[PDB]
Amino acid sequence: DIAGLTPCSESKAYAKLEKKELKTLEKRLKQYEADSAPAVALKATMERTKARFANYAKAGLLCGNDGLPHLIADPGLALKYGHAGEVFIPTFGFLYVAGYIGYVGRQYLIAVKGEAKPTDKEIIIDVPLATKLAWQGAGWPLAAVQELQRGTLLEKEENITVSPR
Amino acid sequence: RQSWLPGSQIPAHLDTPAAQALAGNFGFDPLGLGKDPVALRWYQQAELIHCRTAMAGVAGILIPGLLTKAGALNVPEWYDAGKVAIENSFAPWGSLLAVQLFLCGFVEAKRWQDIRKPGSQGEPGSFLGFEASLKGTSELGYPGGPFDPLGLSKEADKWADWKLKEVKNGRLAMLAFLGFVAQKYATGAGPVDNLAAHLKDPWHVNYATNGVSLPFL
Amino acid sequence: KRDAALPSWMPGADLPGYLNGTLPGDFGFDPLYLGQDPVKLKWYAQAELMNARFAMLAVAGILVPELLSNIGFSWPGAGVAWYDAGKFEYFAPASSLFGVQMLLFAWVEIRRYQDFVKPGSANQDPIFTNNKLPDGNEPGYPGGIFDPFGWSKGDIKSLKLKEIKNGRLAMLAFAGFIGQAYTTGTTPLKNLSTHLADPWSTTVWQNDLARL
Amino acid sequence: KAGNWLPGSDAPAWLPDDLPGNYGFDPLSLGKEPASLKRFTESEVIHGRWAMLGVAGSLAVELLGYGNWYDAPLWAVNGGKATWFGIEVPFDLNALLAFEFVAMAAAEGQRGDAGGVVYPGGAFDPLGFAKDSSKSGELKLKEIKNGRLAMVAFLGFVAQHAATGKGPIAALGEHLANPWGANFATNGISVPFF
Ligand code: CHL
Ligand code: CLA
Ligand code: CLA
Ligand SMILES: CC(/C=C/C=C(C)/C=C/[C@@]12O[C@]1(C)C[C@@H](O)CC2(C)C)=C\C=C\C=C(C)\C=C\C=C(C)\C=C\[C@@]12O[C@]1(C)C[C@@H](O)CC2(C)C
Ligand SMILES: CC(/C=C/C=C(C)/C=C/[C@@]12O[C@]1(C)C[C@@H](O)CC2(C)C)=C\C=C\C=C(C)\C=C\C=C(C)\C=C\[C@@]12O[C@]1(C)C[C@@H](O)CC2(C)C
């Protein structure tokens, strides 16, 4: 398929891998009773193992000669062949959360700079203010862009200290 | 002072006289997206275009849907009409969309330049004598002129009332479309068919029992 | 704020000030305050007349034709339910008749609207300029050639009240035809005969409970 | 002022009284700016004159039995020889486009540099009907009203052909035969239902 890979659902090595893991679990099972606590736990593990291998095949992943899933990172190849969920979609999932955390922290830091004693507002968190800013961060991408266009996102070069040069 | 949530503190930026001049101002801005006055002016235009586009689209899903059930028309489901139309069509969907982007892009571009410089499209000689009627009105997002053939915007007494009706039906239409999308995945049927099912047995056919919305239950 | 001298839909009830008896049939009924805004109430005043006047014609056009058929009077259209007149075949197709209907109504309705927008501005015959309506006519009450018998020269206020009372009752009747026809499945006069046959056991409570 | 398009309505201020064909009809105020009105005044007359020739040509072709206005140019796509009053014409599609483009460009180019002359006269008025100032006023009104009627008539040909797929004279005869059976309502397209 892509880069010589093949769908895991059609991969011989992938299928053989599932048998090896289930065989290992089954070997430990036969040293216990039918419905003892250890036996139930082992059976639960085997169910998750079977579900995991079905899910990855159902997801249409690609397996190499190793018979293990490989991920596609190029946006063009991902959207071309329906691998957007491996790296492309999770890319924009992380950035939203990462920007959320960073934007919320920046809002709080600016908020307390106006207080009389900013340092004491950092070791001892102002929880009522932090919760207020935590919820308003859901719209950070909109607020972040508008700050950039209005020119209030960055400090002036003349207001930043620098070493002799 | 009507508000979306009585007893709550209206955001300060929504209480200014400029903000209260906006139709449908019920003080709803919990995330503070409109704090910057320049941003709120831009988001108001976005709502109007979303409102008007949603109303036209919903009317195109709902009215054909009811008439189809009544037997006066035969129109496929809104989520199938795209495939049905392209078959007995003079062009493939690639060519059809490319033209759509040129025409929409050109028209949208003129609207864009009016947001940046209101009344700037009435530049003498810019259009083939038609620029005079493209100046818009004193209110951004309400062009008027050739876009108001019946002149319903010339009655000062009814002006505020008309704008409120548009935003109210527009907001309702926007939610309706979000319901069409969610109800297609949830139930796998048409909008009017979903309504028929609910009315038959309201207490057993709803989102609480569709087996999707509440996975824990 | 409405005075207590005027008739009231609910005696001893406070009523809106803006319903001060100027309009005919002003009994102060507006629990939802729809007509509070004078501009809107100006529109609703004409809408009531238009919906009422058509309703009076429609109800008359649904009972009299059926009444004649029972009496035995014979005409080609006899014995056709009011909701089956559309299916009936006439000298011309329904579509062609509909097209003519809108073209004819477009002229008269826009003529009527022009007067409402600017009263007295549509009182002249476009072709035979000699013809003209009286200049004192108000919106909704053209007069002139529309009042050939001069009834409007008498107690006009009473006549306006009589018109709106009959009109309001007629509008309710037509809603009865749709509700009754959709439920009973028979013509209106048939429902009346059934009720008179056994008034006590033929109420809507009896009829609808049986169905479900 | 020629008249009033909507009796009981006011005339727009920006429309001059002496402008020929002035019925005070400008609901959209497209001619409010004097610069825009000057261009549109010329364009209405130019459209009217072209429409009047177009309508006359469309009716003449079908009355004389040589076809209808719609299928006259089919010989080019189908493959054939042009005809005019039944006599063969040697030119082909490529030759016609080249000569038409050159001739129209030269004639229209000359008018373009004039600056917006709608009533040139002189060489274009050999019989001198409009030489007298007083007489010209009414002739201009007659020209535009016939021109406006021709513009509407041609729109009727195109719209009617799309619905019925027939020529203008064919449709007129059909309507006369069965007035209540053949009309826009009965063509199955103009009125969505029925
Ligand atoms: C006050 C306005 C008004 C009202 C309340 C009605 C109400 C009605 N009309 Mg009527 N019409 C009205 C005005 C008019 N109608 C017509 C022409 C017709 C026709 C031709 C028909 C009706 C029929 C109907 C019924 C529709 C329900 C039904 O049985 O559907 C089920 C429909 C059918 C079983 C008919 C199937 C065959 C039909 C040829 C298909 C095409 C029907 C059209 C789409 C109807 C369009 C009606 C619209 C314009 C009001 C219902 C009783 C129908 C009827 O009487 O059914 C018993 C019918 O066939 N109307 C005209 C044109 C002159 C009107 C103009 O204003
Ligand atoms: C990090 C850098 C990087 C690199 C090395 C590649 C590499 C590749 N990309 Mg990807 N791509 C990237 C980033 C990158 N991409 C980004 C950031 C985006 C936008 C989110 C895309 C969007 C994209 C699309 C839409 C497509 C590719 C495709 C390709 C392949 C051939 C064309 C190409 O991009 O040539 C070298 C790359 C560059 C010079 C960098 C810019 C690449 C642009 C954005 C895309 C060019 C597409 C090209 C015109 C398609 C022509 C048809 C093709 C079959 C020959 C190649 C494997 C094509 C593919 O699937 O081929 C099988 C394809 O259709 N890429
Ligand atoms: C103009 C008013 C009017 C009149 C005189 C009638 C008369 C009749 N209706 Mg109808 N009806 C009306 C309006 C009217 N209806 C309306 C507006 C609707 C829609 C909700 C219906 C829905 C309806 C149904 C579903 C049924 C009837 C039935 C009946 C019958 C009486 C038994 C019953 O269940 O009544 C129920 C009706 C009502 C409670 C009417 C309430 C609304 C009106 C406007 C009240 C008016 C009161 C006022 C004092 C005037 C009285 C009449 C006046 C002439 C003195 C009888 C033939 C039944 C039938 O056909 O039995 C064989 C039947 O099944 N009607
Ligand atoms: C434009 C739109 C829909 C357009 C639909 C169209 C053209 C459909 C067209 C067609 O269907 C037809 C006719 C026929 C079909 O055959 C084909 C297609 C092509 C499919 C919907 C918008 C829909 C838009 C929606 C639902 C937007 C909702 C926004 C919300 C709720 C925002 C809330 C807040 O932002 C505020 C206001 C303030 C903040 O402080 C707080 C939060 C909470 C963040
Ligand atoms: C309908 C039309 C224009 C209509 C305009 C309208 C209603 C404008 C209305 C308003 O703007 C006002 C005034 C004022 C605003 O406030 C309001 C609105 C409402 C906006 C023009 C037609 C214009 C029509 C024209 C120019 C037609 C030309 C036809 C020709 C040359 C035909 C030639 C041939 O037919 C032959 C002879 C033989 C065939 O074989 C070959 C061919 C080539 C087909």
Short mmCIF file of C-alpha atoms in Angstrom, two decimals, chain C residues 91-93 95-96 98-100 114 118 121, chain D residues 6-8 10 180 183-186 191 194:
data_model
loop_
_atom_site.label_atom_id
_atom_site.label_comp_id
_atom_site.label_asym_id
_atom_site.label_seq_id
_atom_site.Cartn_x
_atom_site.Cartn_y
_atom_site.Cartn_z
CA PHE C 91 -64.62 23.63 -18.44
CA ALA C 92 -60.95 24.52 -17.87
CA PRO C 93 -58.10 22.85 -15.98
CA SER C 95 -54.06 25.28 -13.25
CA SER C 96 -55.38 27.63 -15.93
CA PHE C 98 -55.51 29.45 -10.85
CA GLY C 99 -53.28 31.49 -13.15
CA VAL C 100 -56.15 33.78 -14.11
CA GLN C 114 -52.24 51.50 -2.27
CA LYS C 118 -51.90 56.38 1.45
CA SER C 121 -54.87 57.88 -3.41
CA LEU D 6 -48.10 53.36 -9.86
CA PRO D 7 -51.11 55.69 -9.53
CA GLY D 8 -51.17 57.45 -6.18
CA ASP D 10 -44.78 60.15 -5.83
CA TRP D 180 -57.94 27.79 -21.58
CA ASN D 183 -51.11 29.08 -21.52
CA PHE D 184 -48.33 29.63 -19.01
CA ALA D 185 -50.26 27.90 -16.24
CA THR D 186 -50.77 24.77 -18.36
CA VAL D 191 -46.63 27.24 -11.89
CA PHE D 194 -50.84 21.31 -10.70
#
